[PDB]
Every structure is written in C-alpha cells, then in structure tokens.
Amino acid sequence: MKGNRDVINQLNQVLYHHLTAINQYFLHSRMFNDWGIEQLGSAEYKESIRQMKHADKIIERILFLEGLPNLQHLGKLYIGQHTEEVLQCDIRKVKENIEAIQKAVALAETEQDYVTRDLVQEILEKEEEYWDWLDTQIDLIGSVGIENYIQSRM
Amino acid sequence: MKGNRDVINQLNQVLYHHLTAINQYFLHSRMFNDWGIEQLGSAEYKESIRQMKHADKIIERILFLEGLPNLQHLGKLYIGQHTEEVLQCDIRKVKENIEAIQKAVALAETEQDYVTRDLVQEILEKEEEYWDWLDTQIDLIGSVGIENYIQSRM
C-alpha cells in the first residue's frame, strides 16, 4: 500500500474508539432525553455527531493510504444509570480516545506521515475539549448538588 | 415494564440491523468516493443517514417502552470489491432489514402495540425504496454495461 502499515493499523484503532464513542454518546443523549434532562441530551448528541465526523475523516484517510477501514467491530460501551454516572462513563471513554490518538500522533511522526499526524492532532484538540466539559460538569455537581445540577440541565 | 417484552426484543433486532446497515452503507459510500464514482458515493451516504435516523427512532421507541436499547453488537458487513458486487452486498443487507421489520410489524399488531407498528411500517416503506433503487442499478448495469454504468455514476 502507499501508506505505512503500522500507521494504518493505529488509525484503525482510533476509528474503533470513535465508533464506540458514537454509540455511547448517542445512547446517553437519548437516555437523558427520556429522563427529561434535555440540555445534557443535546450536549451528548452534539458530541456523538462530532465523533461521527472524526470517524469519517479517519475512514477517508485510511482509504487514501490504501488500507482497509475496519467498521465491523466495537469496543465496550460504558452506559450509566444516572446523571453523574453517565458523565463518569463518558470520561472513561474520552480518556481511551485520547490515549489512542496520542499514540497515533507519535507514530505518524516517527514514520513521517505528517498529514496523518495533523489530522489526528485536530481530533485530539476536540477530545480534550469534551474531556474538559465533562470534568466541569462533575465539579458543578459537587458545587451546586445533584438536584440543582439536573434541574439546570433540563 | 410498560411495553411488551417480545415487542421490545424485536425492536432491538430491528435496531441491530439498522446499526449494521449504517456501517456497511457508510463504508460503501467512502469506497465509491475513493474509486471516483461520486454519485454512488452520494447515494450510499444518503441511505446510511436514513439508517441512522431509523436507528434513532427505534432507540427512542425502545426507551419510551422502558426497554434497554442494545448498541453493543453488529452483524456481518457485506463489503463488495467492485461496483456490481457492492450493489449486491447492499441488496443482501436490505433484505435482512426488511425481514426483521416485517416480523416487528406482525408482532406489534398481535400485541396491540399499534404505535410501534406504524413506526416500523414507515421504516419499511423506505427500505423498499432502497431495495428498488438497488434493483434498478443492477438492471442498468445489464442494459448499458458496467463501463457505461460506472461512467454515469462518476
């Protein structure tokens, strides 16, 4: 293939994690909506769409490199049963995403696939943003209490 | 739970097929784009998005009925290696979708879940449309030849 095989394999790992995140965040969105917590339903939906866009770019990059995108398998979904637990499940997932993306950055650099590096660098910045937003929600549950926090996210 | 357990379980079967169809069709879109056959890339993307909307509607219906939507599992993706084979892989997938939807209609009717029936009846109408479109593409390959057919779908 035109691309580096090891780079292609790690891009498929990143895709695996994006595919997993799409489904986790999407179900979390619809669970929050079913509960009437509509603003967190929206935030989870937006991040699900963001993950879908990430996956699209990785698939297209893998195909350009003449590799085979792997959409057949998923990782473990972390599904919470109440608001605070959902947030902690998302935190667990985004940390997995970031670790995989960081290793893709490091590997692309070593193999001199600089365009791939910049692609996953762009995704990483957004994953840090979602991690930050989740951390903030946890702290706010601490500051205002879970009853006030949910009320605010209706 | 408020909904019927067998109806709930068959809705998760329909969701499984939609989630699987999402990934098959989306990959086929990007492969057609990778091959330079952009009108088939676009058609496949549109059908993937429709499957995404179908899955959304089913997830929301399962949650209202107080069941647990299952997004953890995926079926076999039928991935083609050239234009004609891709179309045949899609035909195989939509036939699986339609069969699961038909059993959901029949079962929803029996259990007097008339609102679920109407939801899955609407999805069925769209699945028949995609099936018809695929049949037409295969016939057109026969009528005009694969070289003219691909040329037309650039």
Next chain:
Amino acid sequence: MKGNRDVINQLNQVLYHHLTAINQYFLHSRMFNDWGIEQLGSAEYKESIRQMKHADKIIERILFLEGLPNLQHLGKLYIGQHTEEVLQCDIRKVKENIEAIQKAVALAETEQDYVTRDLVQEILEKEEEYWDWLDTQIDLIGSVGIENYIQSRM
C-alpha cells in the same frame, strides 16, 4: 514638566492599582469559566476590560502632563479558591482602587488640576458600581445559599 509632580505621582499610584486589578479580575474570569460558572466569568471579564480602559486613560493623562507612566510593577493579587472567596478578594481590591482614586481627586483639586480630577472622578463612579455589584453577590449568597447562587451564575 507641564503637570504637577505630586499629581503625576498619584496618577501612577492609580495606574498601579488598575494594572493590578486587570490581572486579578482577568484570572478570576478564567477560573470561573474553568469551574463552569460562566456568568461570573463574564462579569469578571467585563470589569477587567473596564480596568484596562481606566489604565489607558491614566497613561494618556500622565503622558500629556509629561510624566512617565510606570507599568513595571504590580501589587498583590488576591486570588480566591472558591466563588465566595473570589468575590471577597475582589472587594478587597476595589476598596484599594477607590482609596487611591479618592486621594487623586482630593490632590488634583488642591493643585487646581481640574481636568485630571474629572477624569479620576469618572473612574471612581465605575469603581463604586463594581463594589456595589460585589456586595450584592455576597448578600445573594446569603439569601439563596451558595448552591443556588452558583447554579444561577452558570
């Protein structure tokens, strides 16, 4: 020089307090934002910008009077560790600002620098407004409780 030396020196005292207030308020803004308390982040940003405009007006007045604006030095920043303490740190800072401004008004009047007096009198009016706003926030924390107060300032 064309201006009065004591007036010039007290204007640099006012500038010192504005420069210090810029940094305290700006950091408090970004800390509130980091905590998810965005309306207090916004209020603190607005007051930092006002302090930036105050400092600008004083610098321009010192230069017209042919003195040397001193931007090299900073006072103690009072940095809080939670919402209520931040507000109290700001109250301490604005009280220092107002005291320096009041001495500038009194001294400008004595030395018949009536244009400088009016400049610092305008700044004072705005500093009293920020002081009033801070007092109100503290009272509101008392009336509604810190959990409701923070919830409201998200």
Next chain:
Amino acid sequence: MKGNRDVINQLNQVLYHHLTAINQYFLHSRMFNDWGIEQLGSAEYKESIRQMKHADKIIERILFLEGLPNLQHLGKLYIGQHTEEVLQCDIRKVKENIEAIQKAVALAETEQDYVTRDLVQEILEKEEEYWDWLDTQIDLIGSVGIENYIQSRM
C-alpha cells in the same frame, strides 16, 4: 542570516519542485484544452495555480529567513502525449514534490524552525490531495475504458 542555512537550502529545493510543477501542469492544462478535454484542462489549471501559490509562500518564507530564493532554475518537465500518459507524468511529478516536502518537514523539526514546518505541512496536505485525484483518474480509466473516460472529461 536569521534562518538556518540548511533549512533555507531545502526550502529552495521545494521551490525548485513547485516551479517545475507550475510549468508542467500549466502546459498539460493547455494541451488538454487544445485536445478538447476541457474538464481535465481545468483540473490541471487549478493545480498549476495551486503550485504558484505554494511557490509564493516559500519565496516569502525564504526572504523572511534572510535567504536568497532561487527562481533561476527548473527541474525536468514530464510532458505526456495522450491522456493516460499525462496523468502518469503528473503522478511522477507530485511524488517528487512530496519527497522534497517531507524532507523539509523533517529538517525544520530538527532545527526547531516550527513555523517553516507548519508552512510545508500545509502544502503537503494539498500535494497528497492532487496525488489522490490522479490515482483516481488512472483507476477510472481502468474501470470505464479510455474512450468513456475522455468523453467524460470533455
């Protein structure tokens, strides 16, 4: 000079390749137009202009670094005599561009000229895009036949 001499020398190599590509793609554009294959005439023109823009940015970067941009010499032009051969000649050229750009990225990194690195990283992404487009045209000539392919590019 303010810049690193070795970095400057490699930037002049990249410029050499951009200057060469401008002329190859431009002549190919006008040859396709002379043949009546106007859509490939347009694609070659757009890429010629893109190469001109690349050259502009490299020249300006070399001058900022206090080096001497070398516009006096050109590399070998690969000029095809029929559609498929033209595409293969462009593929040969873009591969030369990318190799020179990749070595510029690697060298800028080692010498800690991070702004130069980002400049050539941006160009590289576009060169990969043109390489991809060319690969696609070759495959389409395979899929639809050269007679249909040219017809489509009129």
Next chain:
Amino acid sequence: MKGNRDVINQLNQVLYHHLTAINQYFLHSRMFNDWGIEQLGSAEYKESIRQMKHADKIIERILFLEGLPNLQHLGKLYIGQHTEEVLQCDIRKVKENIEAIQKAVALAETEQDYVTRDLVQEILEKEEEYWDWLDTQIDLIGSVGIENYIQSRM
C-alpha cells in the same frame, strides 16, 4: 494535575513574556501617540492586543491542565526614548518571546502534549510576523532617513 508539570512551568514562562510584551507595546503605542506618530501608535496597539489574546489562550490552557497561571510577575520592560530606539526595544522583546515559545514547542513535543504544542506553534507564527515587521521598519529608517520615516508614520 492532569497536565505535565514541566510543560505547565514552561507555559507560565511564555505567559510571563506575553504579560511583559502587553505592557511594553501598550506604553509604546501611547508614547507614539503622544508624539504624534499615530500610525506606529496603531501598530503597537494592535500588537499589544495580540499579546493580550496570546496571554488569554495560555492562561486557559494552563487552567485546563490543572495548573496555576502566574499573573503576579512581569519581566523587564524595554522602553525607548525615540522612534528608532523603541523599535529596537520591541525587537529585543519579541526575540525573548520567540525563544520561550520555541522551547515550549520542543518540550510539549517531548512530553506528548500535542495540543499545547499546536497552541504555542500558532502564537509563534504571529511573533515571527511582528519581528519581521520591526526588522522592516529599521531597514526603512536606513533607506529613507529617520525624518522621512517618522513623517510617513504620522
């Protein structure tokens, strides 16, 4: 903290230099205006605002990494007494900025904080732009003479 401690410390160094540059350029702006050299007053103001924006992004990045932004201290201000000397003082300052930013890029890379790296890479590009503009003004004073140069910058 979630961030790397050494990266956080170097980000605080970059902030230190941005805080210093804000004040130097701002005073230089108002000094040029006091002298009637309004176009250089404007250029210094714009760059002061640019430095303020740089500082904002670094503060927010430090807080995201769970570090403590240090706004309490400033570096030495280089304040000129006539047009050419002001420009040379700014040149001294921007070189300090760039050295600190380059070491932040190198350190972020080593510790695999790739989003921080991209943030300071973006700032660096702008600092090179201001350095270039300053170099140009010095040369123009050489070409046209200081009397013509100031006249032009009124």
Next chain:
Amino acid sequence: MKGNRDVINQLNQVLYHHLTAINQYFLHSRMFNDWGIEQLGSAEYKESIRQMKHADKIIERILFLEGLPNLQHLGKLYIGQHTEEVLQCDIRKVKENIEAIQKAVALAETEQDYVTRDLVQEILEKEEEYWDWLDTQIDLIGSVGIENYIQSRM
C-alpha cells in the same frame, strides 16, 4: 504542421522571454515587499501576472498552430540589490522582451500569419507601457531623490 515553422520557433522565443520575465518580476515584487516598499511590490506583481497572461496567450497560439511550447528553459534573471538597481534590471528585461516581440511581428507579417501578428502586437503595446513606467520611476528618483522616492512607494 498547420503553422509556419519559423513563426512557430519565434513564438517560442517570445514565450522564453515572458517566462523569464515572470520570475524576475515576481521575485522583485517579494523583495520590495520584504524591504517594506509595498507599492513597488504591488506594481511588480501586476507586471508578473501580465507576463503570465502573455505566456498563456502564446502557449495557446503555439498549440493551435500545432507546435510544441517550450517551458523547460529560462534566461538570465537580472536581480537588483536596491530599489534603483531593480528598476534598471527590469528595464534591461523589458528591452529584451520588446526586441523578441518586434521580430515576431515582422516575421509573422512576412509569412502572412496575420492573427499571430495581432496577438504579439497587443503584447508589445503592454510591454511599452511597462517600459514607460520604469523610465518614469528612474526619472522620479532623480527629481525627488531616492529617500523621497522610496518613502512614496511604501
């Protein structure tokens, strides 16, 4: 071939001079910009683009006449080291351009290639305009002095 071989060969001589002029003028533009003399940067850019359009028209004319445009070779670039020398280098280049164009007009007339003659006659009119502009700049340097002249072209 459909065109006259000697006419075809002289058209390639004109193209050679345009391609050479493109590069000289474009570099002069970016050098003037690098020096802060932006109105001369702009004037030189405009003349480079005109030379690019001239080269395009000649390439298209050679191809219609079924000859082979030669873009592989370049003449001596006359690169100045200061404003006055640059202008003199441009004067030398446009004089070469005009001489090649004049021989193309005379030869096209002899061989009754009246359409080619009119094409090169139009280009000549524009080359005389650039020659006139350059002469004016040199005279203006004499009338106002180089320091005022450069000041005016900032």
